[PDB]
Write an enzyme that holds these catalytic residues in place. Structure first.
Site, PDB file in Angstrom:
ATOM      1  N   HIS A  61       0.812  -1.227   0.000  1.00  0.00           N
ATOM      2  CA  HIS A  61       0.000   0.000   0.000  1.00  0.00           C
ATOM      3  C   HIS A  61       0.843   1.273   0.000  1.00  0.00           C
ATOM      4  O   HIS A  61       0.299   2.378  -0.072  1.00  0.00           O
ATOM      5  CB  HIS A  61      -0.952   0.064   1.188  1.00  0.00           C
ATOM      6  CG  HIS A  61      -0.353  -0.372   2.488  1.00  0.00           C
ATOM      7  ND1 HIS A  61       0.091   0.533   3.426  1.00  0.00           N
ATOM      8  CD2 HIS A  61      -0.203  -1.599   3.048  1.00  0.00           C
ATOM      9  CE1 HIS A  61       0.533  -0.119   4.489  1.00  0.00           C
ATOM     10  NE2 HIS A  61       0.358  -1.412   4.286  1.00  0.00           N
ATOM     11  N   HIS A  91       8.010   7.484   3.950  1.00  0.00           N
ATOM     12  CA  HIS A  91       7.106   6.975   2.919  1.00  0.00           C
ATOM     13  C   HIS A  91       6.241   8.130   2.433  1.00  0.00           C
ATOM     14  O   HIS A  91       6.295   9.239   2.988  1.00  0.00           O
ATOM     15  CB  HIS A  91       6.217   5.851   3.458  1.00  0.00           C
ATOM     16  CG  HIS A  91       5.303   6.297   4.554  1.00  0.00           C
ATOM     17  ND1 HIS A  91       5.668   6.268   5.882  1.00  0.00           N
ATOM     18  CD2 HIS A  91       4.065   6.849   4.516  1.00  0.00           C
ATOM     19  CE1 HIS A  91       4.683   6.751   6.618  1.00  0.00           C
ATOM     20  NE2 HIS A  91       3.703   7.120   5.814  1.00  0.00           N
ATOM     21  N   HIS A  93       2.225   9.328   0.483  1.00  0.00           N
ATOM     22  CA  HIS A  93       0.836   9.050   0.097  1.00  0.00           C
ATOM     23  C   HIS A  93       0.576   9.884  -1.143  1.00  0.00           C
ATOM     24  O   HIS A  93       0.998  11.035  -1.188  1.00  0.00           O
ATOM     25  CB  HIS A  93      -0.155   9.424   1.200  1.00  0.00           C
ATOM     26  CG  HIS A  93       0.126   8.763   2.513  1.00  0.00           C
ATOM     27  ND1 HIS A  93      -0.538   7.631   2.939  1.00  0.00           N
ATOM     28  CD2 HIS A  93       1.018   9.066   3.483  1.00  0.00           C
ATOM     29  CE1 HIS A  93      -0.073   7.271   4.122  1.00  0.00           C
ATOM     30  NE2 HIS A  93       0.873   8.125   4.475  1.00  0.00           N
ATOM     31  N   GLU A 103      -2.714  13.903   2.604  1.00  0.00           N
ATOM     32  CA  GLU A 103      -3.584  13.474   3.675  1.00  0.00           C
ATOM     33  C   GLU A 103      -4.062  14.696   4.455  1.00  0.00           C
ATOM     34  O   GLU A 103      -5.255  14.930   4.561  1.00  0.00           O
ATOM     35  CB  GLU A 103      -2.855  12.474   4.564  1.00  0.00           C
ATOM     36  CG  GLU A 103      -2.456  11.212   3.786  1.00  0.00           C
ATOM     37  CD  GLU A 103      -2.351   9.991   4.680  1.00  0.00           C
ATOM     38  OE1 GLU A 103      -1.557  10.035   5.630  1.00  0.00           O
ATOM     39  OE2 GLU A 103      -3.066   8.996   4.432  1.00  0.00           O
ATOM     40  N   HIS A 116       5.972  11.593   4.537  1.00  0.00           N
ATOM     41  CA  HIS A 116       5.968  11.387   5.980  1.00  0.00           C
ATOM     42  C   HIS A 116       7.316  10.834   6.415  1.00  0.00           C
ATOM     43  O   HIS A 116       7.655   9.696   6.101  1.00  0.00           O
ATOM     44  CB  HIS A 116       4.844  10.415   6.402  1.00  0.00           C
ATOM     45  CG  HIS A 116       3.469  11.011   6.301  1.00  0.00           C
ATOM     46  ND1 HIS A 116       2.326  10.244   6.221  1.00  0.00           N
ATOM     47  CD2 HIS A 116       3.064  12.301   6.255  1.00  0.00           C
ATOM     48  CE1 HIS A 116       1.271  11.041   6.133  1.00  0.00           C
ATOM     49  NE2 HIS A 116       1.690  12.293   6.156  1.00  0.00           N
ATOM     50  N   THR A 195      -2.009   7.529  10.338  1.00  0.00           N
ATOM     51  CA  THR A 195      -3.065   7.696   9.337  1.00  0.00           C
ATOM     52  C   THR A 195      -3.396   6.383   8.610  1.00  0.00           C
ATOM     53  O   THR A 195      -4.204   6.366   7.665  1.00  0.00           O
ATOM     54  CB  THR A 195      -2.689   8.736   8.277  1.00  0.00           C
ATOM     55  OG1 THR A 195      -1.626   8.221   7.470  1.00  0.00           O
ATOM     56  CG2 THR A 195      -2.279  10.081   8.910  1.00  0.00           C
TER      57      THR A 195
HETATM   58  C1  LIG Z   1       2.279  -0.841  12.625  1.00  0.00           C
HETATM   59  C2  LIG Z   1       2.704   0.528  13.138  1.00  0.00           C
HETATM   60  C3  LIG Z   1       2.282   0.742  14.586  1.00  0.00           C
HETATM   61  O1  LIG Z   1       2.227   1.572  12.269  1.00  0.00           O
HETATM   62  C4  LIG Z   1       3.314   2.396  11.783  1.00  0.00           C
HETATM   63  C5  LIG Z   1       2.987   3.680  11.067  1.00  0.00           C
HETATM   64  C6  LIG Z   1       3.870   4.751  11.027  1.00  0.00           C
HETATM   65  C7  LIG Z   1       3.499   5.938  10.402  1.00  0.00           C
HETATM   66  C8  LIG Z   1       2.239   6.072   9.819  1.00  0.00           C
HETATM   67  S1  LIG Z   1       1.825   7.466   9.135  1.00  0.00           S
HETATM   68  N1  LIG Z   1       1.163   7.265   7.693  1.00  0.00           N
HETATM   69  O2  LIG Z   1       2.985   8.310   9.020  1.00  0.00           O
HETATM   70  O3  LIG Z   1       0.872   8.072  10.015  1.00  0.00           O
HETATM   71  C9  LIG Z   1       1.345   5.009   9.879  1.00  0.00           C
HETATM   72  C10 LIG Z   1       1.714   3.821  10.511  1.00  0.00           C
HETATM   73  C11 LIG Z   1       4.479   1.894  12.210  1.00  0.00           C
HETATM   74  C12 LIG Z   1       5.872   2.423  12.031  1.00  0.00           C
HETATM   75  C13 LIG Z   1       6.424   2.565  10.765  1.00  0.00           C
HETATM   76  C14 LIG Z   1       7.721   3.053  10.627  1.00  0.00           C
HETATM   77  C15 LIG Z   1       8.457   3.410  11.756  1.00  0.00           C
HETATM   78  C16 LIG Z   1       7.906   3.275  13.028  1.00  0.00           C
HETATM   79  F1  LIG Z   1       8.622   3.619  14.125  1.00  0.00           F
HETATM   80  C17 LIG Z   1       6.611   2.783  13.160  1.00  0.00           C
HETATM   81  C18 LIG Z   1       4.187   0.712  13.014  1.00  0.00           C
HETATM   82  O4  LIG Z   1       5.017  -0.028  13.527  1.00  0.00           O
HETATM   83 ZN   LIG Z   2       2.011   8.179   6.226  1.00  0.00          ZN
END
Ligand SMILES: CC1(C)OC(c2ccc(S(N)(=O)=O)cc2)=C(c2cccc(F)c2)C1=O
Ligand SMILES: [Zn+2]
Length: 257
Positions: A61, A91, A93, A103, A116, A195
């Site tokens: 995704h 990463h 979006h 977002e 992000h 998110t």
């Molecule tokens: C499964 C779980 C809890 O979700 C995320 C996650 C992070 C960022 C976003 S976002 N799109 O930036 O909000 C959404 C989800 C991580 C994660 C990914 C990379 C580094 C980190 F330290 C944690 C996880 O380990």
């Molecule tokens: Zn993100």
């Protein structure tokens, strides 16, 4: 199961993840009538000199650039909690056309994409313990608009051809994330969430005022990625963004006048 399709996208996530309808969900619209200038906010600084990129991965995704987050000097500093945050991953979006993909929105304006840069607060020990805390992560969000090319983005969009399908991974060393930053680090901040599922409300959001400009050629490369694995029916990776969520009682703070 969750994804961004009609039958498993953002509108469905709450069924498995009840926090999707919580009090501190992200992203949000940033209405510039309502963000309050806060002179106490610590300005952002980066020490990305020793940031050590490891690999880039298509997880079905998005694509993730993973860092060696044992590099204790590779940090983002500042923000509302005056934190020191270890860079671990970034990463994006993006949309199926230039007019959408971000977002967060600004006065309801959507950008072509959102970057992000994910960091965990070092005072919680590791990313795993950090996501259990309301301010455990700092995610630096940066808008992408279409115009001139972003030279620092070239290594990223060009390697995407090597990881076209879900599951593909490539070595990705010596990438300098300083090349992805705009001139100004003026920002908005608010307490929010991941998110994507699990949608944990563990994020101090830091969203830069200034978008970076990327070229049409660069953004097109995003849209050549596949949600699917190799040999499966082709499903192009587009519109992997969650829309703006209720602000509820939160105040958005601005670092700048
Ligand atoms: C499964 C779980 C809890 O979700 C995320 C996650 C992070 C960022 C976003 S976002 N799109 O930036 O909000 C959404 C989800 C991580 C994660 C990914 C990379 C580094 C980190 F330290 C944690 C996880 O380990
Ligand atoms: Zn993100």
């Amino acid at each position: 199961h969750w994804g961004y399709g009609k039958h498993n996208g953002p509108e469905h996530w709450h069924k498995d993840f009840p926090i999707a309808k919580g009090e501190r969900q992200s992203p949000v619209d940033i209405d510039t009538h309502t963000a309050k200038y806060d002179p106490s906010l610590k300005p952002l600084s980066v020490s990305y000199d020793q940031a050590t990129s490891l690999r880039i991965l298509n997880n079905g995704h998005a694509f993730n650039v993973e860092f060696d987050d044992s590099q204790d000097k590779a940090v983002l500093k500042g923000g509302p909690l005056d934190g020191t945050y270890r860079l671990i991953q970034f990463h994006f979006h993006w949309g199926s056309l230039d007019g959408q993909g971000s977002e967060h929105t600004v006065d309801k304006k959507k950008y072509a994409a959102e970057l992000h840069l994910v960091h965990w607060n070092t005072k919680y020990g590791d990313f795993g313990k950090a996501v259990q805390q309301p301010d455990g992560l700092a995610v630096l969000g940066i808008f992408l608009k279409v115009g001139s090319a972003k030279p620092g983005l070239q290594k990223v969009v060009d390697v995407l051809d090597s990881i076209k399908t879900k599951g593909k991974s490539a070595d990705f060393t010596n990438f300098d994330p300083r090349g992805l930053l705009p001139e100004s680090l003026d920002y908005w901040t608010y307490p929010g969430s991941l998110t994507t599922p699990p949608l944990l409300e563990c994020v101090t959001w830091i969203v830069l005022k200034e978008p970076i400009s990327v070229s049409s050629e660069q953004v097109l490369k995003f849209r050549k990625l596949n949600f699917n694995g190799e040999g499966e029916p082709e499903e192009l990776m587009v519109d992997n963004w969650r829309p703006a969520q209720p602000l509820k009682n939160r105040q958005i703070k601005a670092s700048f006048k």
